[PDB]
């Protein structure tokens, strides 16, 4: 029946909101670069985009905020109350989501500064939310089985990822009907669509306030020696979270750069300002629907039949092998745009089928109650550090650059995945 | 001891916040015109200012929201409790005050629409508040002195206006030192000072968020029948008309300060002065008038509130309002060349404005209107007052804004007639 579905959605609303808020920023970055950096006339190259520093800062402010918000709310926030922290975080995220669409001026520096300032505290709220709070897993999930509880609630991160692309596509298509302009190869100034394109990204960013209020409503009506013996378990958990997050965020954020270099989306200086965003949204929507979404539904039915160890092991192995194959066959995959789609999508599939639905129960069924919270917080902090490295690291190689740099970045991604496969051996299952 | 004024401020924080929010908009009302309405080149007259419709909307939409919010959190708002309405209104105030400083775009239409939208709900929160809370304060008001407490907590309006002028003064002075530009008579484009001046009014507007947080902190921890319409109906129409004719006069003489002064000495003309320093001059004049004239009214009222009563003081206040303002109206031509007595007359008009009627108007419905239907009469009287403020913002402002010397004369004459009519109607409320 649908009562189980209602319970699953009520539990996973937090993950859905977090995923939407964190992954709605990839689609609108190109529009911001095209609007606030392209000058009138003086054309010598592709349409202006964000500088490396500005692009990296815009992408990573939210994640740095998540780190410094989670640390504070965890260490110095346990003496205030669950309902109180829920309310504060869920109102802060909504307020910052609404404020991200409003600017303090007209200059590009003022707009960028306001956007970064509001994204910082949006990420602060997201990190301090601690979306699922360990309680429901310390419930039925920790005791009897972890079969269709964790892997079912986490199926909403995929839903949020799809919905981000869906709303971007809907808004861009609606604004595209009444806004027709020649491509950048034609009239250079008119391709900006400045009077109209200045509102679409604001609308996309401020749509995210609705999920925060929805989860507010839906959740405010619901009432050293031990470490020495454990030893390598701590480093195992931290590494298995770090080397997963560094790949997941890298492959979700670098979507806007790999596709223009590999078929699919056409050349940058051949498309209008809005329809390019629409094409990127459609590509992301298709990849997240056919690739990412089936991963959770494959995972849910195999938690008990296969286990938790071998599934993660094979997931990491396929991650590494597919990444290495894509890196090696770059030149061949340039011409053939057909199988590149599936080579890119099965990476997401094996990520979802792999340790993506596995690294949170890893602290569970282990780490006895004496120091469980400290180890869980340490593992989460390691994951957030991996996310920050993904936003501020490999992005420096993938963004703009040339053919050699993206091949290199794929090489380090494959190496890191193989290292994670090596490191996930010192964690058995009982 | 400090306890007396500590309680006074802790009770009048709401009035101070309301006055600051409602009267901080007339200071930056010239800057918006000088920034978003003046085009480059084409210098034919004084620097461009807001259109009449836009100016009237910006000035009066907050008061319209005040009326609507009062009506809602009144007739459909008694099922939530005091704490709930306190919290929702005091958080709406802060949210809207913060949002008013941020724009949804670069076009003047988008900025104007965002400003009006975020001022509407600010007024909504203002009106759904009942600052003094003359229901908790009504328990003490059954039978005792109606002086010191109320007449002192009502003094917060003067200091709110003073602080609005002071903040505008401070920010304009700070931003003036770094940016120097010639007059509009000189380099027309440089007179705007666009890159620096686009932030000063924003900061002035968002500074008003702090009083909302302060009052939230200070007030979160503190735990119609035929016979009544015939025996008391005359009193009811008296209260409604008196509140109407007090609010129209007060809001007209406060909101049109930016138009009276430039046309009457004091501040220099329009098209010889930069954008920031004209704001500086207007802030200086308004601050001085509010300090010397507006402030002592409540203090002199609190001294003799019981020593004479609440009837004669209101009667005389209305009478001297009418006489002083008629004298301003008919002696305008002779007064055009000397400014000292003009400033003195304006200060005395404000002094007698806060002296007589302002204090007695608020507490008057409480002592009448027995508890059977007291709330309904108080609500209808407050609605009449808000309607009067709306009329002041959307009425006489039409004559005052642009004006052709005849229009300002007519505005003064109609205001004098209104105050005389209020003085006449004041006879239908005795004192016991």
From Swiss-Prot, chain A:
Cytoplasmic compartment spans: 78-84, 131-146, 304-308, 368-373
Keyword Membrane recorded: yes
Compartments it resides in: Membrane
Gene3D superfamilies hit by this protein: MFS general substrate transporter like domains
GO molecular function, one term: phosphate transmembrane transporter activity
UniProt cross-references to PANTHER family, sorted A to Z: SOLUTE CARRIER FAMILY 22 MEMBER (PTHR24064)
Protein name per UniProt: Inorganic phosphate transporter 1-11
């Amino acid at each position: 029946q649908m009562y189980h579905m209602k319970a699953i959605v009520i539990a996973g609303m937090g993950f859905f909101t977090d995923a939407y808020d964190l992954f709605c920023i990839s689609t609108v970055s190109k529009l911001l670069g095209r609007l606030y950096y392209q000058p009138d006339g003086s054309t010598d190259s592709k349409p202006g985009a964000l500088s490396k520093t500005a692009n990296n800062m815009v992408i990573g402010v939210a994640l740095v905020g998540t780190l410094m918000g989670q640390l504070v709310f965890g260490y110095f926030g346990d003496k205030l109350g669950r309902k109180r922290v829920y309310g504060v975080t869920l109102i802060l995220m909504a307020a910052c989501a609404i404020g991200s669409g409003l600017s303090f001026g007209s200059s590009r520096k003022a707009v960028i500064g306001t956007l970064c300032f509001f994204r910082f505290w949006l990420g602060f709220g997201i990190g301090g939310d601690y979306p699922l709070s360990a309680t429901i897993m310390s419930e039925y999930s920790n005791k009897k089985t972890r079969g269709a509880f964790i892997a079912a609630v986490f199926a909403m991160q995929g839903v949020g990822i799809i919905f981000a692309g869906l709303v971007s596509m809907i808004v861009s298509s609606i604004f595209l009907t009444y806004n027709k302009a020649p491509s950048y190869k034609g009239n250079h100034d008119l391709s900006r669509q400045m009077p109209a394109a200045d509102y679409v990204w604001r609308i996309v960013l401020m749509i995210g306030a609705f999920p925060a209020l929805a989860t507010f409503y839906w959740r405010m009506k619901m009432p050293m020696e031990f470490a020495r013996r454990h030893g390598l378990h701590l480093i195992g958990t931290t590494t298995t979270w770090f080397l997963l997050d560094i790949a997941f965020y890298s492959q979700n954020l670098t979507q806007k750069d790999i596709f223009p270099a590999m078929g699919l989306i056409s050349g940058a200086a051949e498309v209008n300002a809005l329809t390019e965003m629409f094409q990127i949204s459609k590509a992301s929507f298709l990849v997240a629907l056919l690739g990412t979404f089936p991963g959770y539904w494959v995972t849910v039915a195999l938690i008990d039949k296969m286990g938790r160890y071998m599934i993660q092991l094979i997931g990491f192995f396929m991650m590494s092998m597919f990444m290495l194959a894509m890196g090696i066959l770059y030149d061949y995959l340039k011409t053939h745009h057909f199988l590149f789609g599936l080579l890119y999508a099965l990476t997401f599939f094996f990520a979802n089928f792999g340790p993506n639905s596995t690294t949170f129960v890893l602290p569970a069924e282990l780490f006895p109650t004496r120091v469980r919270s400290t180890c869980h917080a340490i593992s989460a902090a390691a994951g957030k550090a991996g996310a920050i490295v993904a936003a501020f690291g490999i992005q420096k190689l993938t963004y703009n650059s040339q053919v050699k740099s993206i091949k290199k970045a794929l090489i380090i991604l494959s190496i890191t995945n193989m290292l994670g496969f090596f490191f996930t051996f010192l964690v058995p299952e009982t």
